[PDB]
Amino acid sequence: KPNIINFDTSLPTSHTYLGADMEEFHGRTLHDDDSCQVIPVLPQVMMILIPGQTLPLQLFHPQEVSMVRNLIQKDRTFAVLAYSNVQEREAQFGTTAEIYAYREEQDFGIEIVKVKAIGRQRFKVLELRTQSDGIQQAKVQILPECVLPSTMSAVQLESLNKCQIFPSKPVSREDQCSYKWWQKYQKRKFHCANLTSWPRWLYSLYDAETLMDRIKKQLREWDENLKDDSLPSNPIDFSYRVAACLPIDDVLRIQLLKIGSAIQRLRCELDIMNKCTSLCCKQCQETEITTKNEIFSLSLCGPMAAYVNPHGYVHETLTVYKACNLNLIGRPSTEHSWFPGYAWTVAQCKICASHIGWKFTATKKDMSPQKFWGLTRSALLPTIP
């Protein structure tokens, strides 16, 4: 955990390897809540998109290129099915993805389309139909996202309304500024708990701000260098960002996607965070690679994000400081680098000789991270007893 990072953590966000003269769009479109719409689904994609997460793509097949070209004009949004119920095209929920970057090349007479898309509203899969062209246009119902008022907004006394605006939180994060302030906040916000049948701490267990504070505490305990700057302030965006960065298996991600309440999602994320222990090789099932304490963020989008290989394959990479039981094969290469400034060898499980990830080594001598590893999500098994 060196002492400092001098690397611009805003660089692995624009995906400079994909290109530079991207045709960007601004128009944001959200349809409604609880309606039925039919929208194309990209094939060859095996992932779950959490809302607010970005997705880079490289497409070669003529049908996908043609349908993306058509989709650019109509609404710029497609569907990313969960595809997690087994693997035989069983889908129940999915995420809408909107495109905000687009370019086309020629190559060796084969059209290549590079696209960056971001996650949006969730839906549920009702009916799926397959078209001869290749696009599996499906009928889905947009799942609604709801916010809830304060627990005391109904039982609060009118004479204490003027005392509901607390002074600004102190910035010196320390005791007597966190503990004392939070104690007074609990005592003043949930004073009307004496009018009900439940204590004050029970109501604090369902308070959004307290849950976000606890999640931030644990995140900073894992990532000491990480500061309370990049994390959002809205409960919904905060919950989605936390969900899109936990090194968990697929079932937990599905169950987090099913939840339609920010508070329930925050509580489930807290439980999962309390449960996570380590990661192991998927094929070997026993070889342990790295622990959660070594997870650290080189990007402002969290420790985990999705990138695209030079051939179209999308990998979700988790950055760690150290890795174990890995053997490197090949010569360090510096092309299509996802972290501008580093080089990438290919790493493979030392036992089953399966690809786990890459080891990115710095080129310039004056760079604080001199060697950090990247681990593919669909190559590791969460080792929770």
């Binding site: 060796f108 030079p310 051939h311 094969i329 090949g330 010569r331 290469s333 092309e335 299509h336 000789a353």
Partner: protein, 126 residues
């Protein structure tokens, strides 16, 4: 297991330096060499370290652009067809050993397309 690629500069075999051979030596060879993908296909595949204990079993004859450039610079080839065939086998001995869709395989194919467009403009017979 671990046989050196075909020997450079076969002395018994006679050699002609033709303009087609020089085209192969410079425009084809160097352009193939300076490619972001042609980094594995340029040194004799080492199955011991890459740990692939069977390649030499499935692959009867091993070779690379390195040894073929060496054979092109040190007088080996009597004509060109030998060199084009050698490069074609260099492609085939990878498509056959690895499986469709993989990465090395998807890389080579690009190299093979580059090679084909390059050699279809080989010099007239001289």
């Amino acid at each position: 297991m671990n046989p050196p690629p075909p020997e450079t500069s076969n002395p018994n075999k006679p050699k002609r330096q033709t303009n087609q051979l020089q085209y192969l030596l410079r425009v084809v060879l160097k352009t193939l060499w300076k490619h972001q993908f042609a980094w594995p296909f340029q040194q004799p595949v080492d199955a011991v370290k890459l740990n692939l204990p069977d390649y030499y079993k499935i692959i009867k004859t091993p070779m690379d652009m390195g040894t073929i450039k060496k054979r092109l610079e040190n007088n080996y080839y009597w004509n060109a067809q030998e060199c084009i065939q050698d490069f074609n086998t260099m492609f085939t001995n990878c498509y056959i050993y690895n499986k469709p869709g993989d990465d090395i395989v998807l890389m080579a194919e690009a190299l093979e397309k580059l090679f084909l467009q390059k050699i279809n403009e080989l010099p007239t017979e001289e």
